[PDB]
Design a protein around this ligand. Structure first.
Ligand code: CHL
Ligand code: CLA
Ligand code: CLA
Ligand code: CLA
Ligand code: CLA
Ligand code: CLA
Ligand SMILES: CCCCCCCCCCCCCCCCCCCC(=O)O[C@H](COC(=O)CCCCCCCCCCCCCC)COP(=O)(O)OCCN
Ligand SMILES: CC1=C(/C=C/C(C)=C/C=C/C(C)=C/C=C/C=C(C)/C=C/C=C(C)/C=C/C2=C(C)C(=O)[C@@H](O)CC2(C)C)C(C)(C)C[C@H](O)C1=O
Ligand SMILES: CC1=C[C@H](O)CC(C)(C)[C@H]1/C=C/C(C)=C/C=C/C(C)=C/C=C/C=C(C)/C=C/C=C(C)/C=C/C1=C(C)C[C@H](O)CC1(C)C
Ligand SMILES: CC1=C[C@H](O)CC(C)(C)[C@H]1/C=C/C(C)=C/C=C/C(C)=C/C=C/C=C(C)/C=C/C=C(C)/C=C/C1=C(C)C[C@H](O)CC1(C)C
Ligand SMILES: CC1=C[C@H](O)CC(C)(C)[C@H]1/C=C/C(C)=C/C=C/C(C)=C/C=C/C=C(C)/C=C/C=C(C)/C=C/C1=C(C)C[C@H](O)CC1(C)C
Ligand SMILES: CC(=O)/C=C/C=C(C)/C=C/[C@H]1[C@H](C)CCCC1(C)C
Lengths: 192, 165, 41, 207, 219
């Protein structure tokens, strides 16, 4: 298991051998095997998408190319979408259609595979071929990094909806005054 | 305004009618003393007439060309123009009270029908039972809907006598 | 006493008393709340 | 019967000699249900210990404010601590307190759900468990002997502190000044200053 | 059986007995004689009590905080209009339709649960979440997703006590909301204002002097 979530609690038995499992299931959403399998695939997929999203959000900001919240803003109220400091000649309609077609094809091919291949498909998806040789520890690291990235993305969204600044500015502001610049000072998070 | 009707507040015929009624009452009052019984009765009638006209004009009733209040009997039309108290609300009130009395009578008849001598119970009513059933009849909508959804509110057609066609 | 109360429970006596009570209640409602043309709540 | 020679033990407290300060006092029969009594015992211990800490803090702060020992921070009423300025604002301190208390209280709740379960730290350090309401945090080993007498002392002091805090709050809402100032104002006569003439408790007297 | 009744000395009706929480043998109108009707009324009472509890809480707690000074919110009868005049205020019709659309789905699902408690637990109904939609055998008490802390799961008697507390609090809140409606309609003031006005002069400030409860025609 390697973890207990609640040091003195009794973790469920169906979450004893799964990787990156801490026995966290107070609501009992994985009691049925089918639900557990679907949730496992969804968790790994969510972690991967969140890691990619967090990496992109941090990269576009640390590189001085713009924020994540204002990225689609230039497209609206006119047009022209910038990328790497260049310019892409596509509008909202064409962009939406292209993304819809590509994502639909990719997800359709991914969702039609076997249950195990829908979350851990080796072969062509592992060019370096490092899957072989104890993949449990690697799977655990992937799941944990995905959970951390999911929390980071939720933090970006909530922090922007509360304070109104992007990740780097919020981090710098908190580092400047760690005592009077936090979630407790803004009149949204802590009301009383 | 709903169907070419003018509110009684701005109706000239309504005001003229009130003025004429009060004028007739005062004309009759002029033939009496100031503190006699007929004078007091006429003054009370005048006050009641004025109060009635003022209440009708204040309640938002609609008056026609003849100057008399008109009622709107149409849901939606009366609900959007503020005339639900003309027929809609009275309809609900009636339906409720009528169903209350009907349900109380139905329950009493069904309760005494199981007695060994029901005809006597029909000519000689059981006051305590009738009182209890009358009180229970106030929840007639709920009871009637429950009996309908339960199927006990109806009698099978095959169990009811019928003519030989 | 039982026979008297039984006679008072007959259909005609109960009918007249019920009609009298309903008429009295309506008369007093109209006496205290007269000229109620519409249901103004 | 312990709290009243003319009363009778409410049965549910007669066969419970392991409870600290068991004087058979329960006129409302709130502890009749064994689970209810089990929860009430923990609630009493928590309220009593917190009241002891709070009353001791209020008394020490007021003593330093009256006699004069603490700096500008102590020279202020307990209810006026908001006027003082610390390292962090009120909101930051409140949030930090909520997080720390959430951690500590969740550990305590986990222990309450299953006594003896949560007793190990993430680093492997373990302690010996000794009853529910007594986790065993005894670095001085004072519970090795006369444990019942020690817990009786604790429960009596806790109840006294709870009553003291309630009285301090009532006095503040009815009399002006600090608790020590109220005690001095009383001891001044003391046949005139005694809630009867405060114009708040009787209410019926002089509005 | 021998539990406390609403009217001491009066025997409880046979259709009520003593198993449902809040069973005090109170049914002078004999509305729950039918078992199906009684079950529907029990579910309706639970729903009305829970909604009334939420509303009374959202009406009293904000009012109490506003009276103290922290958290300034308008009076409950004007809260709907105050938001209407806001800048980015959502249209009333659109807001009501969205709320009704969401409530349609959740309420219809709960309706199917009432007809058959294990209806929503049908395998494959949802995206693996139907397993947590199985009730506890009694409509109106669905564990799983709901009740995440598992309160009252220690034993059956513990759950029964909590059910009684819930039913009493729900009934109290229902009566309280009805009182709020009547008080505001009779007196254009808030509940706290009415309570403060009554304590100042109970014999001169009550429902007998509001000019609405007691009609002026009689006097
Ligand atoms: C994982 C999802 C992900 C998504 C949805 C986006 C989406 C976006 N990024 Mg991006 N990024 C993402 C990941 C990442 N970004 C970056 C680094 C950047 C930079 C530095 C910039 C963007 C920018 C943009 C925007 C430009 C529009 C676009 O797609 O142009 C077309 C993009 C392509 C055709 C990419 C093709 C890649 C393929 C050849 C390999 C757009 C909203 C730009 C922006 O916001 O401008 C205002 C911008 O300057 N991204 C990194 C590396 C750290 C990522 C890592 O995962
Ligand atoms: C008893 C027969 C009856 C009749 C003859 C009418 C007639 C009318 N209704 Mg009406 N209505 C009725 C019953 C009736 N209603 C009942 C029982 C209800 C309660 C559900 C309503 C609720 C209602 C509403 C809410 C509205 C009307 C409206 C109207 C008017 C225009 C709607 C229309 O007919 O367009 C065509 C009808 C089609 C079915 C097509 C019209 C004069 C509308 C109105 O007030 O006019 C502006 C309005 O909005 N009615
Ligand atoms: C179906 C026929 C019908 C209808 C609908 C009405 C309706 C009405 N009549 Mg009328 N009336 C009728 C026949 C009818 N009447 C007949 C046949 C006569 C000749 C005897 C009269 C003579 C008459 C007179 C002299 C007066 C009325 C009045 C009234 C109004 C008073 C309402 C009221 O009493 O306050 C409200 C009453 C209640 C809320 C009581 C409801 C609860 C009861 C007790 C339930 C009963 C259960 C059984 C009302 C709109 C009065 C009025 O002012 O006109 C505007 C009035 O002065 N009527
Ligand atoms: C649950 C118990 C409790 C609580 C909530 C408080 C809370 C407080 N104490 Mg107190 N205190 C306590 C117990 C407690 N005390 C006890 C048992 C004693 C006796 C030793 C004291 C003696 C004491 C003194 C002498 C003073 C306070 C002061 C204060 C206030 C600011 C302290 C501070 O800066 O934080 C602590 C900072 C860090 C932990 C870092 C604060 C409201 C100070 C104050 O501001 O007076 C109003 C003050 O001068 N306390
Ligand atoms: C155990 C509870 C307790 C708590 C929570 C506090 C908390 C506090 N004390 Mg205090 N103090 C305590 C007990 C306590 N004291 C006791 C028992 C004594 C008597 C020995 C003192 C005597 C004392 C003095 C003399 C002073 C404080 C001061 C302070 C404040 C700033 C401390 C500092 O930064 O150093 C000191 C900072 C300096 C600039 C000097 C702070 C809020 C200082 C203060 O009021 O801040 C201006 C201060 O002057 N305390
Ligand atoms: C915990 C023990 C305790 C102690 C030692 C004191 C001591 C004191 N109280 Mg106090 N009080 C207490 C508890 C206590 N109180 C509680 C629990 C309450 C809430 C009901 C109050 C409410 C209260 C008020 C409103 C007032 C005092 C006042 C006083 C002072 C004057 C004596 C008096 O009238 O007291 C009254 C004693 C009681 C009301 C009940 C005491 C409980 C028992 C008898 C303790 C043994 C005095 C120094 C008065 C003051 O401030 O002096 C000017 C004052 O007006 N007390
Ligand atoms: C960033 C861009 C990443 C694109 C990577 C796409 C790789 C898709 C290959 C998936 C695949 O090979 O699955 C096959 C499915 O069989 C099939 O049905 C053949 C489908 C292959 C479609 C051709 C993809 C070309 C488009 C690639 C664009 C770049 C083999 O079978 P399997 O399901 O067991 O998978 C086990 C493979 N290790
Ligand atoms: C004794 C008794 C019976 C009584 C049964 C009753 C009665 C039960 C009551 C229920 C309630 C809940 C009554 C509320 C009873 C409450 C009230 C308030 C009743 C009447 C008050 C009136 C009419 C005065 C109004 C005024 C006017 C209009 C003004 O102008 C202003 O000055 C203000 C003001 C002075 C208030 C019995 C049948 C058992 C047996 C015998 O038969 C007898
Ligand atoms: C487990 C459990 C069990 C028990 O029993 C119960 C409970 C408690 C319920 C639980 C828990 C849960 C949870 C925690 C959840 C959470 C989640 C999340 C957060 C997700 C996210 C998730 C997240 C995600 C995906 C995210 C993603 C992101 C992205 C894509 C991004 C994108 C972008 C970019 C790049 C940049 C640009 O410029 C912009 C954009 C476009 C925007
Ligand atoms: C037994 C019984 C049974 C039967 O049957 C019935 C009857 C009779 C009912 C009963 C009785 C009961 C009672 C008496 C109770 C009470 C309690 C209490 C008092 C508590 C408190 C309790 C109390 C408490 C906790 C308190 C606490 C406190 C604190 C923390 C404080 C704090 C503070 C400080 C330090 C200082 C600053 O400056 C301020 C503050 C911040 C404020
Ligand atoms: C039992 C029985 C049986 C026999 O046999 C007969 C009889 C006698 C008939 C009976 C009795 C009955 C009764 C009493 C009933 C009542 C009920 C109720 C009151 C309900 C409520 C109920 C109530 C309810 C739901 C309520 C709810 C509420 C709410 C949500 C609120 C809301 C709100 C809020 C938050 C705030 C804002 O700003 C405003 C609003 C919007 C307003
Ligand atoms: C929005 C819309 O119109 C339809 C969306 C359909 C989906 C996601 C179907 C997805 C799969 C699932 C879960 C079952 C088998 C086929 C798929 C593609 C793997």
């Amino acid at each position: 298991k390697a973890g207990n979530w609640l040091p003195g609690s009794e973790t469920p038995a169906y979450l004893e051998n799964l990787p990156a499992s801490y026995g966290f299931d107070p609501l009992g959403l994985a009691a049925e095997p089918a639900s557990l399998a679907r949730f496992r695939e969804s968790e790994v997929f969510h972690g991967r998408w969140a890691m990619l999203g967090a990496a992109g959000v941090l990269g576009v900001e640390v590189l001085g190319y713009g924020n994540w919240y204002d990225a689609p803003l230039p497209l609206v109220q006119g047009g022209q979408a910038t990328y790497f400091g260049a310019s892409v000649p596509f509008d909202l309609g064409t962009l939406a259609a292209i993304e819809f077609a590509a994502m639909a094809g990719a997800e359709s091919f991914r969702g039609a595979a076997e249950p195990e291949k829908r979350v851990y498909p080796g072969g062509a998806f592992d060019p370096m071929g490092m899957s072989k040789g104890n993949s449990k520890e690697l799977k655990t690291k992937e799941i944990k990094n995905g959970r951390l990235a999911m929390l980071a993305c939720l933090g970006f969204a909530a922090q922007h909806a509360a304070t109104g600044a992007s990740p780097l500015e919020a981090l710098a502001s908190h580092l400047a005054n760690p005592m009077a610049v936090n979630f407790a000072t803004n009149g949204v998070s802590l009301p009383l | 305004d709903v169907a070419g009707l003018t509110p009684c507040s701005e109706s000239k015929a309504f005001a003229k009618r009130k003025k004429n009624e009060v004028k007739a009452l005062n004309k009759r009052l002029k033939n009496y003393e100031a503190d006699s019984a007929p004078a007091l009765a006429l003054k009370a009638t005048i006050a009641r007439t004025e109060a009635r006209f003022d209440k009708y004009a204040k309640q938002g009733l609609l008056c026609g060309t003849d100057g008399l209040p008109h009622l709107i009997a149409d849901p939606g039309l009366a609900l959007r123009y503020g005339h639900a108290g003309d027929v809609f609300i009275p309809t609900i009130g009636f339906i409720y009270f009528a169903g209350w009395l009907g349900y109380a009578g139905s329950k009493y008849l069904q309760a005494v029908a199981a007695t060994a001598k029901p005809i006597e119970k029909e000519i000689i009513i059981d006051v305590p039972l009738a009182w209890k059933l009358l009180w229970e009849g106030f929840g007639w909508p709920l009871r009637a809907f429950a009996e309908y959804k339960n199927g006990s509110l109806m009698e099978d057609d095959a169990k009811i006598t019928v003519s030989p066609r | 006493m039982k026979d008297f109360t039984t006679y008072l429970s007959t259909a005609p006596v109960l009918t007249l008393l019920s009609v009298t009570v309903v008429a009295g209640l309506l008369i007093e409602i109209n006496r205290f709340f007269p000229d109620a043309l519409i249901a103004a709540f | 019967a312990g709290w009243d020679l003319s009363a009778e033990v409410p049965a549910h407290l007669a066969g419970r000699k392991d409870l600290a300060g068991n004087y058979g006092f329960d006129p409302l029969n709130l502890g009749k249900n064994p689970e209810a009594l089990k929860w009430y015992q923990q609630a009493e211990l928590q309220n009593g210990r917190w009241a002891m800490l709070g009353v001791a803090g209020i008394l020490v702060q007021e003593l330093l404010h009256s006699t004069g020992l603490g700096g500008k921070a102590a020279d202020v009423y307990w209810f006026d601590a908001g006027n003082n300025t610390f390292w962090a604002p009120k909101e930051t301190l409140i949030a930090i307190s909520f997080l720390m208390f959430n951690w500590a209280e969740l550990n305590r709740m986990q222990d309450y759900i299953k006594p003896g379960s949560n007793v190990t730290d993430p680093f492997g350090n373990k302690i010996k468990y000794v009853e529910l309401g007594y986790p065993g945090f005894d670095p001085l080993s004072f519970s090795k002997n006369n444990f019942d007498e020690w817990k009786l002392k604790e429960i009596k002091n806790a109840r006294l502190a709870m009553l003291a805090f309630l009285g301090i709050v009532a006095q503040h809402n009815a009399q002006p000044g600090s608790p020590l100032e109220q005690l001095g104002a009383h001891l001044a006569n003391p046949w005139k200053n005694h809630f009867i003439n405060n114009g708040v408790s009787p209410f019926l007297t002089d509005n | 059986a021998t539990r406390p009744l609403w009217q001491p000395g009066v025997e409880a009706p046979k259709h009520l007995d003593g198993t449902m929480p809040g069973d005090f043998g109170f049914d002078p109108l004999n509305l729950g004689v039918n078992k199906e009707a009684l079950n529907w009324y029990r579910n309706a009472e639970l729903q009305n009590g829970r909604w009334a509890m939420l509303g009374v809480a959202g009406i009293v707690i904000p009012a109490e905080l506003t009276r103290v000074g922290v958290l300034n919110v308008p009076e409950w009868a004007e809260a709907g209009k105050v938001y209407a005049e806001s800048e980015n205020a959502i249209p009333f019709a659109s807001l009501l339709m969205v709320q009704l659309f969401l409530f349609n789905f959740v309420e219809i699902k709960r309706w199917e649960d009432i007809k058959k408690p294990g209806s929503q637990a049908e395998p494959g109904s949802f995206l693996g979440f139907e397993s947590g939609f199985k009730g506890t055998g009694i409509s109106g008490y669905p564990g799983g997703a709901f009740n995440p802390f598992g309160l009252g799961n220690s034993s059956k008697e513990a759950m029964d006590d909590l059910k009684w507390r819930e039913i009493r609090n729900g009934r109290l809140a229902m009566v309280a909301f009805l009182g709020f409606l009547s008080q505001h309609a009779a007196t254009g003031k808030g509940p706290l204002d009415n309570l403060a006005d009554h304590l100042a002069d109970p014999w001169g400030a009550n429902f007998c002097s509001n000019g609405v409860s007691i009609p002026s025609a009689l006097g």
